[PDB]
Design a protein around this ligand. Structure first.
Ligand SMILES: Nc1ncnc2c1ncn2[C@@H]1O[C@H](COP(=O)(O)OP(=O)(O)OP(=O)(O)O)[C@H]2OC3(O[C@H]21)C([N+](=O)[O-])=CC(=[N+]([O-])O)C=C3[N+](=O)[O-]
Length: 190
């Protein structure tokens, strides 16, 4: 129409609490799930396809993000991990993000695999801002772990999220730091 419907993101959110409660037990990892800005509004269109994205994001964080208990106090922190999902008003843009206080992705290691395959050389590397070094997992086929047979019929390249985000004219950023955690943003229009 010529009048799009804005709805609270509250709707797409209230669903996660329970799935996080499952992925938590499923992986035996008590995760303290926290949701903020639940009263933000976003186009009814976005709302629909926006569930899987954030979902995958929570999925990674609860699986790969949070670590088990002494690995945490041994690292120096609370036994219980914290997964924070949020969304506010930034200009005319709805900024959503999934912060976890995780283990976090390691940026030089990526280069070790991104280089052990050639999308960059030694020299470039020194010009890749932390952002660019991470944008790499956006590359279709970037994790070359799964490939020969253990290639299970399904999956979702972290690009389907840059797809679901790009089908939407969205933009995602990734900020990590070894053993502190990982913060992934998804800036959207309207
Ligand atoms: N929120 C998150 N917290 C932690 N890890 C996350 C997160 N989100 C996505 N990941 C990526 O997911 C991988 C899972 O890490 P870990 O749980 O120790 O091992 P898994 O073999 O069980 O995972 P897999 O089943 O291969 O996805 C890591 O692989 C890598 O970056 C990590 C990784 N790493 O953790 O060091 C290095 C790497 N390269 O290339 O060097 C590529 C990854 N990757 O592609 O996913």
């Amino acid at each position: 129409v010529m009048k799009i419907r804005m709805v609270p993101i509250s709707f797409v959110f209230n669903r996660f609490p329970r799935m996080v409660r499952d992925l938590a037990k499923k992986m035996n990892k008590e995760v303290n799930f926290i949701m903020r800005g639940e009263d933000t509004e976003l186009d009814r269109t976005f709302v629909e396809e926006i569930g899987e994205p954030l979902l995958h994001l929570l999925r990674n964080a609860i699986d790969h993000g949070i670590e088990p208990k002494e690995e945490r106090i041994a690292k120096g922190k609370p036994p219980i991990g914290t997964l924070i999902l949020s969304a506010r008003h930034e200009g005319n843009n709805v900024v959503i993000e999934v912060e976890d206080d995780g283990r976090g992705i390691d940026k030089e290691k990526i280069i070790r695999k991104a280089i052990e395959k050639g999308l960059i050389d030694e020299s470039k590397a020194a010009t890749l801002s932390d952002q660019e070094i991470l944008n790499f997992l956006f590359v279709p086929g970037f994790s070359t772990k799964e490939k020969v047979s253990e290639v299970s019929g399904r999956g979702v390249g972290m690009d389907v999220v840059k797809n679901v985000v790009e089908s939407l004219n969205g933009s995602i950023s990734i900020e990590s730091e070894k053993d502190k955690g990982t913060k992934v943003t998804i800036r959207l229009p309207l």
